[PDB]
Design a protein around this ligand. Structure first.
Ligand SMILES: Nc1ncnc2c1ncn2[C@@H]1O[C@H](COP(=O)(O)OP(=O)(O)OP(O)(O)=S)[C@@H](O)[C@H]1O
Length: 216
């Protein structure tokens, strides 16, 4: 599991802290949503769980962890390359990830059916395509933990439903990975195990769905 006790850090060598008194357990094989308002330390907590931000006074334990950031990024290479990301290619695995991301038709829409040279930052692609490619990169890698920083911001309702069904609840939940996804929707609340509510950089309440509905 991913254990955190006494969260405390900020974005400076000295200054007022934004991370304050966070204690969270992320057990294996469990969907964990993080919900809250705009500016409640969701992605900050994501990067702190990563070890990206060495906290001032606190303990954090859990490694190579797959992670798709909020702002999508690409390489100066092909689509297959960005989705493989220096990994030995697979037939069934890669085709599964391609189909489960609702990406094969739009991939075939491009001027080059595949191995198309993705431009610098993705000028000849749209935001939703970049996001789907990032989510495919995150899902395709073989690892224990996956983070997805709101992968449903530039997607429709149909594509988001198909992604959360085929790629998340059927493919991620298949191999029993520790999926930690942060977003704000309705369909995903009853599909997770632990609900995490954040307010002003503090965990307001914590627990499961029933422990959240039986509390204030
Ligand atoms: N890379 C960074 N460097 C310095 N400051 C940052 C950085 N990222 C975020 N911040 C600051 O940290 C504060 C909180 O940022 P976030 O944690 O990303 O907000 P959030 O609502 O919890 O998650 P979002 O909005 O979905 S990314 C913001 O006010 C930023 O000014």
């Amino acid at each position: 599991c991913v254990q955190i006790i006494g969260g405390f850090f900020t974005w400076t060598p000295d200054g007022i802290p934004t991370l304050s008194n966070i204690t969270i357990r992320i057990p294996r094989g469990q969907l964990t949503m993080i919900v809250g308002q705009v500016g409640c330390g969701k992605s900050s907590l994501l990067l702190a769980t990563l070890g990206e931000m060495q906290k001032v006074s606190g303990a954090v334990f859990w490694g190579p962890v797959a992670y798709a950031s909020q702002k999508p990024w690409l390489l100066n290479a092909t689509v297959e390359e960005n989705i493989t990301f220096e990994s030995p290619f697979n037939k069934q695995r890669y085709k599964m990830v391609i189909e489960a991301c609702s990406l094969q038709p739009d991939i075939d829409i491009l001027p080059h059916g595949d191995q198309t040279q993705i431009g610098e930052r993705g000028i000849n692609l749209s935001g939703g395509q970049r996001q789907r490619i990032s989510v495919a990169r995150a899902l395709y890698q073989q690892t224990n933990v996956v983070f997805l920083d709101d992968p449903f911001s530039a997607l429709d309702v149909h594509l988001s439903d198909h992604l959360m069904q085929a790629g998340i609840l059927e493919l991620l939940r298949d191999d029993k990975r520790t999926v930690v996804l942060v977003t704000h929707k309705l369909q995903y609340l009853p599909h997770a195990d632990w609900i995490i509510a954040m307010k002003d950089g503090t965990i307001q309440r914590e627990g499961t769905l029933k422990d959240f509905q039986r509390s204030e």
